[PDB]
């Protein structure tokens, strides 16, 4: 059982656009109960992002059609579109639960006090995947996953504020996603704008704290913050 082969597998699977294989390899790496390098973290994130991403994209297409045919008033067709939506939801939720279990029982658990970058990165993932659950949940189940999403982002934001520079890509990326959560999930546009503007402004104030290694990644997330802000206003 060779950790380096599993990582190489993941790199191969990514190149061949086989994201299930990539997720499986990186899951297996995580299960070895040893910390992930930066490259390994991203390999895990990219893998599950695509696996869940294809279901999210399918669910939107299906929901969108469900709306139109629901209005059209043809049951037999409506039942089948709805059943298909449910089938995709179950897939999506299974992927989210899979990631969350890795996060809670391996990745967040094994972060030491000083591994701030990793804690924020993982807590942000935890917020993201509960947010993906929130996108498709209704009733009490929605309320629960929304609370969980909020608690993950909230904690990640505390750690980021205290221990990372305003221009740090991971901190910026969290502000980005957390603000999206505020707008789309909590329907709190004021809170969303405040977070995105603050994060953007704070990065700009300390713009000289950019290393050439982070310049490109930070400035690009900053554009996204601004893009969202322009849209929301």
């Amino acid at each position: 059982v060779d950790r380096e082969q599993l990582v190489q597998k993941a790199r191969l699977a990514e190149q061949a656009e086989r994201y299930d294989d990539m997720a499986a390899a990186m899951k297996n790496v995580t299960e070895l109960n040893e910390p992930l390098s930066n490259e390994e973290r991203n390999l895990l994130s990219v893998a599950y992002k695509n696996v869940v991403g294809a279901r999210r994209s399918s669910w939107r297409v299906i929901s969108s059609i469900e709306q139109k045919t629901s209005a059209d008033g043809n049951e037999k067709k409506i039942e089948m579109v709805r059943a298909y939506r449910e089938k995709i939801e179950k897939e999506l939720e299974a992927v989210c639960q899979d990631v969350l279990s890795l996060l809670d029982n391996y990745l967040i658990k094994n972060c030491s006090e000083t591994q701030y970058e990793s804690k924020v990165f993982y807590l942000k993932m935890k917020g993201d995947y509960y947010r993906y659950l929130a996108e498709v949940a209704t009733g009490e189940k929605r309320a629960t996953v929304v609370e969980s999403s909020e608690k993950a982002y909230s904690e990640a934001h505390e750690i980021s504020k205290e221990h990372m520079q305003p221009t740090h890509p991971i901190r910026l990326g969290l502000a980005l996603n957390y603000s999206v959560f505020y707008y789309e999930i909590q329907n709190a546009p004021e809170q969303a704008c405040h977070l995105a503007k603050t994060a953007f402004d704070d990065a700009i104030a300390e713009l000289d704290t950019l290393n050439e290694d982070s310049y490109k990644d930070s400035t690009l997330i900053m554009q996204l913050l601004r893009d969202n802000l322009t849209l929301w206003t």
């Binding site: 993201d128 990326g173 999206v180 996204l224 969202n228």
Partner: peptide, 6 residues
């Protein structure tokens, strides 16, 4: 229509 981290 808001965009999250790619």
């Amino acid at each position: 229509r808001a965009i999250s981290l790619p």
